[PDB]
Design a protein around this nucleic acid. Structure first.
Ligand SMILES: [Zn+2]
Ligand SMILES: [Zn+2]
Ligand SMILES: [Zn+2]
Lengths: 210, 84, 242, 686, 196, 194, 392
RNA sequence: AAAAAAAAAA
């Protein structure tokens, strides 16, 4: 009961993580997007109690299409509460492979001391965190969520020059939004929202991450 | 912030909010005995004179449209086209 | 003038007509009052029609009608049967004529005596007009009530619907020009109310020691009282003019 | 002058008017002002204001005047309409049996000041010259007006029968070329509904012509009502004795049925439905039985009424009343409900001491078995007092929070401003919308459009839209020889038609992507079918004669139309992307309706008709744009706060079919206004 | 015994109360699909109506649709889905409330409101806690509610009111930059041609 | 004169509108103002439950006479047959009870209360009695014969809860009604001739 | 008036400094007497000063030499002997008092902190949110930690002559501040030096001295501009006196027998100040001075806000509460909503409406008396000179 | 002449 449900939720979480990596412009193959539950059972195992697969066994490294040295790690700790010891273990793994992006998927909780740790290690390495309950549902696949596109700084400058817009008088989106966490949006970026309009067909808006 | 004439991105069609104030201001100017640009056909209410000289677009009013970035575009009466 | 029935049929007199210019029956009967049939089904007053039928029956017969509720001795069919014997239509309908032309009305009409009550809301006690009159000793606004000759209340939703129309000049007229206009002299450096003697044409700011840089601002009087009240609350609404 | 009634709930509750001096000491105005002002002439005190500057008088003339404010931007519908006995005599005057003499139409002639002093030839010429009601309503309608609707008493089986264009009942309402031809008018055709005669005469002729048409109706109709007359009486409230016996037998059968329901519930034979308890199941069964009996008796009462019954004609005129009013007049009142429920046991298991304890019969429940004509028992009269107090309570209680919500909504969007670049900004200049309503158009000049490229099958799409030149028989009977010579001289026409078909396929795919539930009704300006009909009628288009319009000229005209109908200007990629994003539904409707098959086999448009059509489409799409300098935030707040005063009408006649906790009405919008911090009735639809 | 009688849960969600099973009878909660002929077919699938909203324990179930299931709790949509989904959900709830009584309001007036709702990136309310917390002027905020508190906050913080709103210019009495007052009229000296 | 029902200095804590100017417009308006009943609930409550016309107001208050506005359901008018209780001393009913058969509370065991029927006089528990039907019939006879108990005194026999409640206080409202035994009225044609 | 009529562009709010209050006032030496009438003539330095404004319809202003319509009214000042709290600013004042030190009047977190800089660049142009973030940062600070020699944890470390200055901490614990109305109490959960006791009451003078010694740079990070809104100006030391336009002389019959509530409240203020300055000059006991300060603060607070809960209501002569300036502004019938939002128009009429079917919709039937009463102000043109001539 | 209270109409 626990093994089958754990394997099912691990496969669903891995599929959600792979779709998140595909949505962020990273080098993602089609078979990992279309990995079935039986494919996950054959590749990794079906009994998570006896380490088949282990929580550290499933570790995902993905690369970017344009810049191959820009890569992301995905970490699955087994413990419910995350201390600074395992964060420092991931960090000591993280400098020795010369990569600036990783996401740790917590299970139960992750301490405010480690919150402050992730705050003050931020402008060298990006170490995002995610809850296991939030990664059982793809956010962008919902019918209430329109299309979100991350936009570069040159197109942002073109948007500011075309409409005579300033950044403080733009439409805003909080940095703690689940959509912004899904795309990994930082403060100062502008996301483009394409939605269906019943009076014009489709509409495009621009939101500032704050 | 003087926008050049070829740089004007505002509409070329004069809407009714401009029409009401230009008609009122021009009829008030005629009501203080301004020269009338067109021929008079016995009309005594200067608002009617304001319409019948707005038809030939001979009203010396420059509209200063204000863009949200505190820039202004100057549009003349004859550059704008009557619509109702 | 406001009239009403005994069944909630309130209304006002739209117009008056002389006897030669309105409808008359075959017996030359000009009614005292005419009403709208469209007020009948929406208000759901069948008892008004039963009152009219019983009034016609009691006025032809010569008896005082009984209108006691929950009485099985009074029925619509019984009143109709008794009214049929007096040479009239059993539903109380009558054939009338045009007043202006004299032609017969194609649709037969229902006539009879009812009981109507006048109301105290006369137009003579409610008409009010005002061009210019007294102003308040505090805010210089018009009075309240017809007895004090006060103007109308340009309320919040008037400003709401005029903003919805988006005509700024009517707002500037009704809320600045015809309510409480005032002129104040303001120091440019301090932005507060400065001393202005109009006789010798002198201007002086008591704090900025300013004699030349004094400007004139037109404003509502209530805004001036708001600014003075804020100046009493250790608040400086500095209105610079440059 | 400015004419205003308090309370002002919306934009239309204060107009501009022209002073006419009358001796008496009251305010005098037209009857059609009663609908936007919500006036009732029952002691309504009302205000007038005088502009003290003549530029403000010019602003009153150009903005605040009544005919320029005919169509609301709230729901793209008229706010004034033909009402009361004027509408009743419009309904009674368009009837087929109304044969009207030379003298009476002569009397009606001088009350048309827009008449051209050209009297029509009579419908009947021998032996006596007689006109008809449609012939004299034809003189009232100006310009080119073409219109299709139906009467409120139109049977649904008539449309698929052989009599769909020739009605024995005179129900389908047809207007062609600005003269009334067919049908009896009602609330649907001459009321505040969208697509009415008033809406299209505003949209096709202008503000002043429609406003004169409003006044030209009412004087002629009220002068004809002097000849005809209209009257309700106590005889209109009494039906046939056979109908009365049938109604009493149906009421007795319903009482026997609910007694049997009570007996089987007491005998442990009532199985509870899922989703509710046995109490709710029993109450729902009793309420359904009583409501079905009331509706059946009301239908039997309405069907048995004759055409001479003025109450039925007044109800089907649509000026006032409904079918439940007729049912309460004739058959029965029904079940009295407090908060949509049973009359509560105020005493110990008794609603009244005159009943018995633990009685659930319809006498003690609150059901009224007698009509108001027959009279009520004192117990059911007390139950009607129970029912009638709740309406006054619901009117009195919620209107404080309704006005508070309206003031809060009008304070929050008091400066949401459309600027000169087409964008939407607040007082601080923060960008809210790039275009107003995401298309940059005003809400007054938009209407309802049927979308033909959504619902239909793929084979219907192939046989209905794909233009084929191989069928030479249709090609010969449809096109003239000059078009054949012109297109055979060219060579790019076949691939041009193939590209048109590909664009139609792509537009159908995009429309199916946008609308997943197959909604074929959109809100768009510039109704294409009406102006195609107008240029058919103006240029006298023969639909059984070959035309001289080549499809290549049609495609060139459509492309020039879509290039010249811009909203977002600029040659930039962002500007072009916003241009086809704002006009995507308009482009889809233009390509779907101005296809090469509709204008050649179906509508058979000519060349000069086509250029007049593209000029009219360009002009009407230009004038339907959102005006730079228009407040939209306070307009939106008032257009949403106006229905907040009208969601108390559906309080009665409620039983509930589902036992789900849900908040409806004022509270719902109140919470969405507080960002629904805590849902009043938290529910998931899974 | 009281602990295992009144507190523990055998199955389900503690935040969810009564749950109903039903089939929709209208073409609004049915599944609309496209057939092979190109027609739209509405399939009346079985569906759930639960009292109490917690879709972290509902959408993450074994056989629950992750796409079409929504909620009426706007704040929970904000902490689950996002601010544009909040805009769409507020528009859908307003449409449901207006269509319950049959009243029709145009989409542009609702969309302007719903884009005002999502202006700052979070849920601002039309109250004294969402309007008075904006970046607007002092006379924007004091003229609605809590006049004295907003005025003393502006006095203490030396807040500059730039006179861009409409009620500001209504208070100080000149022509507002609003409607037909959002521009200036200039006399053309060269256009003064021959007159009388 | 002012209407504030209390001290002049502390009139802010006093009720307003107890004393009103008499409406001398018609005779019917004067009669309606002389028979007016005012609810103490203020006219700003969003709760509809005090504003609902109750089922217990049959023949007590007028069902179809309330002012319009925010004061609907609170201001009401008396019925045509209704009569307000003046108030009377509850003494001789108590002496008649204690001399007839009734057993006082201070002279009984606490374990002998469940079988008997309690007697409440103006909300005060006095004792118990084991034959409530015969006692209530005797009380009805003594109230009808106008001997000791006046007709103003209200009395309830809670059969399902074994209680007897006697109310003699002011503020009660009553309707005079005919008396029916054995399916027949007590009013005869001899009473019509009288 | 030969003054340039220009349009104002923006409104700058602020706090009137007591030097500015003394500079605005035309009452030289301050208002000293509570008596309005002195032998049939106005008294200088009183509540009916001719320098403040005019009296009746025949009098002229002593300052600007105008009538009611010409004189806008001129303010006065009262020099209080001891400073008192402004009650409405109290909800702001603790927000500074919980962020600044109780002893050395310095900031609880040093202004070169990166979190402070991130708040400053984050909240540019938003001073209220800046103060909110500062108060959220300083909610957990209980000790005035500082000292340049408090980081000597290294051994054999050479001192750095290019070292930045460190934080200045007087080594004192900041007390918790409690309030039950106008009284302010401070409690130390951790004991300071033995000369300071654990529970103290803090008057307005201690808060005035604390907020006086705060530099402008610490006020800038506090989101509160020192040019117009210094924090020491919130404590009332010089009370402004409104002119006769704000407080009109209510005339009963011929002569003004009674004044309004504001004049009586200012008379109570003058009497309170005179009693306090008489008691402190006489060398009276400490409880008498404390009672005088308490009643002066009570009169000042009831002049400002009479709607404060937990604060004794001001007693008027007619059994009513006093109507303060907050009651004049806040409310539906207030000076904002009932006098600026909804001020009454002049040219208007109102009557009962009746139907008229033959009129078109763009016309209204107007009664003759209303049309005679209401006037249209038409300009005179040569086109219609004869018609307006025959009209006049 | 202010303020408070009461009665109402829409
Ligand atoms: Zn100065
Ligand atoms: Zn002066
Ligand atoms: Zn310190």
């Amino acid at each position: 009961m626990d093994d089958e449900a754990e394997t099912y939720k691990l496969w669903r979480i891995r599929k959600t993580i792979m779709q998140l990596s595909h949505d962020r412009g990273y080098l993602v193959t089609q078979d990992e997007l279309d990995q079935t539950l039986e494919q996950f059972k054959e590749m990794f195992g079906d009994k998570p109690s006896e380490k088949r697969p282990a929580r550290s066994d499933l570790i995902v490294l993905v690369a970017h299409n344009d810049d191959p040295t820009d890569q992301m790690f995905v970490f699955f700790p087994e413990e419910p509460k995350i201390g600074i010891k395992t964060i420092k273990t991931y960090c000591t793994r993280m400098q020795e492979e010369n990569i600036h992006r990783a996401i740790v998927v917590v299970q139960g909780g992750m301490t405010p001391s480690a919150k402050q740790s992730l705050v003050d290690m931020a402008p060298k390495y990006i170490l995002e965190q995610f809850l296991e309950s939030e990664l059982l549902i793809n956010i962008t696949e919902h019918e209430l969520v329109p299309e979100h596109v991350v936009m570069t700084v040159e197109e942002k400058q073109e948007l500011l020059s075309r409409y005579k817009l300033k950044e403080n008088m733009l439409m805003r989106i909080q940095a703690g939004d689940p959509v912004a966490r899904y795309f990994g949006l930082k403060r100062g970026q502008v996301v483009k929202i394409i939605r269906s309009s019943e009076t014009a067909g489709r509409y495009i808006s621009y939101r500032l991450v704050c | 912030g003087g926008v050049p004439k070829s740089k004007r991105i505002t509409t070329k069609y004069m809407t009714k909010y401009e029409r009401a104030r230009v008609l009122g201001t021009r009829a008030l100017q005629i009501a203080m005995c301004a020269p009338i640009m067109v021929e008079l056909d016995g009309e005594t209410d200067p608002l009617q004179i304001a319409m019948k000289e707005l038809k030939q677009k001979k009203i010396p009013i420059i509209i200063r449209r204000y863009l949200p970035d505190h820039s202004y575009e100057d549009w003349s009466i004859d550059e704008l086209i009557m619509v109702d | 003038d406001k009239f009403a029935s005994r069944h909630g049929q309130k209304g006002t007199c739209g117009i008056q007509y002389r006897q030669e210019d309105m409808a008359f029956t075959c017996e030359g009967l000009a009614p005292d009052i005419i009403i709208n049939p469209h007020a009948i089904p929406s208000r759901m007053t069948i008892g008004h029609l039963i009152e009219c039928l019983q009034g016609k029956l009691g006025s032809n017969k010569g008896e005082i009608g009984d209108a006691t509720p929950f009485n099985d001795a009074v029925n619509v069919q019984k009143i109709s049967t008794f009214l049929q014997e007096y040479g009239y239509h059993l539903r109380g309908n009558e054939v009338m004529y045009n007043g202006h032309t004299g032609r017969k009305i194609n649709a037969q009409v229902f006539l009879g005596p009812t009981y109507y009550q006048r109301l105290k809301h006369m137009v003579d006690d409610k008409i009010h007009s005002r061009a210019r009159g007294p102003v308040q000793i505090l805010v210089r606004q018009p009075m309240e009530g017809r007895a004090r000759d006060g103007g109308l209340r340009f309320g919040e939703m008037e400003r709401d619907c005029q903003i919805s129309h988006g005509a700024a000049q009517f707002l500037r007229e009704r809320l600045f020009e015809v309510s409480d206009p005032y002129r104040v002299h303001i120091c440019n450096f301090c932005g507060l109310i400065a001393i202005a003697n109009l006789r010798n044409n002198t201007f002086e700011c008591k704090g900025c020691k300013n004699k030349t840089q004094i400007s004139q601002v037109r404003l509502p009087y209530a805004a001036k009282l708001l600014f003075q009240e804020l100046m009493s609350m250790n608040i400086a609404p500095r209105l610079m003019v440059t | 002058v400015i004419f205003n009634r308090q309370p002002t709930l919306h934009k239309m509750s204060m107009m501009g008017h022209r002073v006419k001096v009358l001796p008496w000491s009251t305010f005098r105005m037209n009857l059609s002002c009663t609908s936007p002002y919500n006036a009732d002439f029952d002691g309504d005190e009302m205000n007038l204001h005088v502009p003290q500057s003549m530029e403000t008088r010019a602003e009153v003339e150009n903005i605040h005047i009544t005919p320029r404010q005919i169509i609301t931007p709230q729901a793209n519908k008229p706010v004034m309409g033909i009402v009361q006995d004027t509408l009743t005599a419009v309904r009674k005057m368009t009837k087929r049996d109304v044969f009207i003499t030379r003298e009476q139409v002569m009397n009606l002639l001088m009350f048309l000041p827009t008449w051209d002093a050209k009297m029509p030839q009579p419908c009947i010429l021998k032996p006596r010259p007689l006109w008809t009601g449609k012939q004299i309503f034809s003189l009232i309608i100006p310009g080119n007006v073409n219109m299709i609707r139906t009467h409120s008493t139109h049977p649904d089986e008539e449309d698929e029968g052989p009599y769909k264009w020739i009605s024995p009942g005179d129900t389908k309402v047809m207007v062609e070329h600005g003269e009334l031809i067919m049908g009896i008018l009602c609330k649907k055709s001459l009321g505040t509904s969208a697509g009415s005669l008033l809406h299209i005469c505003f949209l096709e002729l202008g503000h002043d012509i429609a406003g004169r048409f409003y006044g030209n109706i009412q004087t002629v109709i009220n002068n004809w009502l002097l000849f005809e007359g209209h009257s309700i009486g106590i005889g209109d409230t009494i039906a046939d004795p056979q109908t009365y016996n049938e109604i009493q037998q149906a009421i007795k059968k319903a009482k026997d049925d609910v007694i049997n329901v009570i007996q089987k519930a007491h005998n442990m034979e009532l199985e509870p439905t899922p989703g509710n308890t046995l109490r709710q199941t029993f109450e729902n069964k009793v309420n359904r039985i009583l409501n079905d009996a009331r509706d059946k008796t009301g239908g039997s009462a309405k069907k048995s009424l004759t055409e001479y019954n003025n109450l039925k004609a007044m109800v089907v005129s649509g000026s006032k009343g409904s079918n439940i009013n007729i049912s309460q007049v004739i058959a029965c009142v029904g079940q009295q409900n407090v908060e949509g429920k049973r009359i509560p046991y105020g005493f110990r298991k008794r609603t009244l001491p005159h009943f018995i304890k633990d009685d659930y019969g319809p006498e003690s429940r609150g059901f009224v078995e007698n009509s108001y004509l027959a009279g009520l028992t004192p117990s059911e009269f007390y139950f009607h007092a129970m029912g009638g107090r709740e309406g006054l309570i619901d009117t009195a209680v919620k209107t404080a929070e309704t006005g508070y919500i309206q003031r809060r909504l009008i304070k929050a969007m008091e400066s949401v401003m459309v600027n000169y670049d087409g964008t939407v900004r607040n007082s601080v200049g923060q960008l809210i919308q790039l275009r107003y309503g995401e298309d940059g158009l005003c809400g007054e000049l938009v209407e309802f459009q049927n979308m033909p490229t959504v619902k239909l099958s793929n084979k219907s799409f192939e046989k209905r839209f794909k233009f084929d030149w191989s069928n030479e028989r249709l090609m010969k009977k449809v096109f003239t020889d000059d078009v054949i010579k012109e297109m055979t001289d060219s060579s790019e026409a076949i691939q041009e038609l193939e590209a048109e078909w590909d664009r139609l396929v792509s537009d159908r795919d995009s429309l199916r992507q946008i609308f997943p539930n197959g909604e074929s009704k959109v809100v768009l300006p510039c109704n294409l079918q009406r102006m195609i009909w107008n240029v058919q009628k103006i240029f006298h288009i023969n639909k059984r004669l070959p035309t001289d319009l080549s499809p290549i000229r049609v495609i060139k005209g459509v492309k020039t139309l879509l290039e010249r109908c811009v909203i977002v200007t600029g040659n930039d990629r962002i500007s072009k992307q916003a241009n086809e994003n704002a006009t995507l539904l308009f482009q889809c409707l233009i390509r779907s309706t101005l296809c090469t098959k509709y204008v050649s086999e179906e509508f058979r448009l000519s060349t000069e008709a086509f250029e007049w059509l593209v000029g009219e489409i360009e002009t009407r799409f230009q004038q339907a744009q959102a005006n730079p300098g228009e407040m939209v935030g306070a307009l939106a707040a008032q257009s949403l706060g106006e229905p907040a005063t009208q969601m108390t009408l559906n309080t009665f006649h409620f039983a509930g079919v589902s036992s789900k906790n849900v908040t409806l009405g004022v509270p719902r919008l109140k919470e969405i206004i507080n960002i629904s911090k805590k849902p009043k009735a938290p529910s998931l639809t899974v | 015994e009281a602990n295992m009688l009144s507190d523990m849960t055998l199955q389900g969600i503690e935040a969810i109360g009564k749950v109903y099973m039903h089939l929709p009878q209208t073409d609004s909660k049915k599944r609309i699909v496209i057939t092979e002929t190109g027609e739209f077919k509405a399939i009346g699938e079985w569906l759930l109506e639960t009292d109490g909203t917690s879709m972290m324990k509902v959408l993450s179930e074994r056989d629950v649709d992750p796409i079409r299931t929504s909620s009426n709790d706007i704040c929970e949509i904000f902490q689950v889905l996002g601010i544009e989904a909040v805009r769409k959900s507020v528009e859908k709830e307003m449409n449901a409330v207006l269509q319950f009584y049959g009243l029709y309001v145009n989409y542009r007036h609702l969309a302007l409101l719903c884009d005002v709702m999502t202006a700052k990136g979070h849920l601002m309310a039309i109250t004294r806690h969402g309007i008075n917390r904006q970046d607007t002027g002092a006379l924007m905020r004091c003229s609605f509610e809590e006049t004295v508190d907003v005025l003393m906050d502006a006095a203490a913080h030396a807040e500059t009111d730039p006179m861009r709103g409409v009620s500001e210019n209504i208070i100080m009495g000149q022509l507002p930059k609003m409607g037909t007052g959002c521009f200036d009229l200039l006399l053309d000296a060269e256009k003064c041609r021959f007159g009388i | 004169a002012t209407g504030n029902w209390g001290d002049q200095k502390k009139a802010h804590q006093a009720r307003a509108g107890v004393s009103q100017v008499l409406n001398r417009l018609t005779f019917a308006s004067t009669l309606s103002h002389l028979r007016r009943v005012n609810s103490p609930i203020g006219r700003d409550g969003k709760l509809a439950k005090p504003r609902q016309l109750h089922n217990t107001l049959w023949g007590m208050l007028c069902p179809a006479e309330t002012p319009e506005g925010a004061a609907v359901g609170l201001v009401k008018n008396l019925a045509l047959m209704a009569y307000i209780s003046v108030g009377s001393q509850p003494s001789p009913i108590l002496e008649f009870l204690e001399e007839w058969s009734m057993e006082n509370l201070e002279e009984i065991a606490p374990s002998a209360i469940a079988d008997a029927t309690k007697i409440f006089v103006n909300g005060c528990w006095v004792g118990i009695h084991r034959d409530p039907e015969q006692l209530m019939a005797t009380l009805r006879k003594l109230r009808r014969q106008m001997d000791i108990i006046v007709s103003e005194v209200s009395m309830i026999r809670d059969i399902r809860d074994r209680e007897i409640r006697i109310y003699t206080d002011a503020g009660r409202i009553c309707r005079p009604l005919l008396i029916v035994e054995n399916g027949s009225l007590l009013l005869k044609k001899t009473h019509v001739e009288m | 008036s030969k003054a340039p009529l220009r349009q104002v562009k923006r409104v700058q709010f602020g706090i009137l400094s007591p030097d500015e209050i003394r500079r605005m006032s035309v009452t030289e030496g301050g208002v000293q007497f509570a008596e309005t009438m002195e032998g049939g003539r106005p008294k200088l330095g009183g509540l009916m000063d001719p320098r403040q404004g005019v009296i009746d319809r025949t009098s002229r202003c002593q300052t600007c030499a105008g009538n009611m319509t010409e004189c806008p009214g001129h303010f006065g000042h009262i020099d209080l002997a001891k400073p008192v709290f402004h009650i409405g600013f109290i909800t702001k004042t603790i927000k500074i008092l919980r962020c600044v030190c109780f002893y050395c009047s310095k900031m609880l977190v040093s202004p070169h902190n990166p979190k402070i800089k991130e708040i400053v660049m984050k909240s540019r142009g938003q001073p209220r949110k800046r103060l909110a973030y500062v108060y959220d940062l300083c909610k957990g600070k209980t000790i005035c930690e500082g000292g340049e020699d408090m980081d000597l944890t290294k051994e054999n470390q050479q001192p750095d002559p290019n070292k930045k200055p460190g934080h200045g901490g007087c080594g004192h614990y900041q007390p918790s501040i409690r309030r039950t109305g106008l009284d302010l109490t401070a409690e130390w959960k951790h004991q300071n030096e033995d000369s300071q006791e654990k529970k103290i009451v803090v008057s307005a003078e201690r808060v005035w001295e604390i907020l006086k010694h705060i530099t402008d740079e610490e006020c800038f990070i506090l989101g509160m501009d020192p040019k117009y809104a210094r924090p020491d100006w919130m404590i009332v030391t010089v009370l402004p006196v409104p002119p006769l336009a704000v407080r009109p002389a209510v005339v009963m019959f011929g002569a003004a027998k009674n004044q309004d509530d504001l004049t009586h409240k200012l008379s109570d203020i003058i009497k309170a100040n005179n009693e306090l300055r008489k008691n402190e000059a006489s060398g009276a006991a400490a409880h008498v001075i404390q009672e005088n300060i308490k009643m002066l603060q009570f009169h000042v607070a009831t002049l400002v806000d009479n709607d404060m809960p937990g604060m004794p209501r001001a007693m008027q002569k007619s059994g009513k509460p006093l109507k303060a300036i907050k009651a004049r502004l806040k409310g539906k019938e207030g000076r904002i909503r009932g006098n600026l939002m909804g001020k009454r128009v002049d040219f208007s009429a109102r009557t009962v409406i009746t139907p008229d079917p033959n009129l078109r919709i763009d016309q209204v039937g107007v009664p003759r008396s209303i049309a005679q009463n209401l006037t249209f102000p038409e300009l005179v043109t040569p086109f219609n000179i004869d018609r307006m001539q025959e009209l006049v």
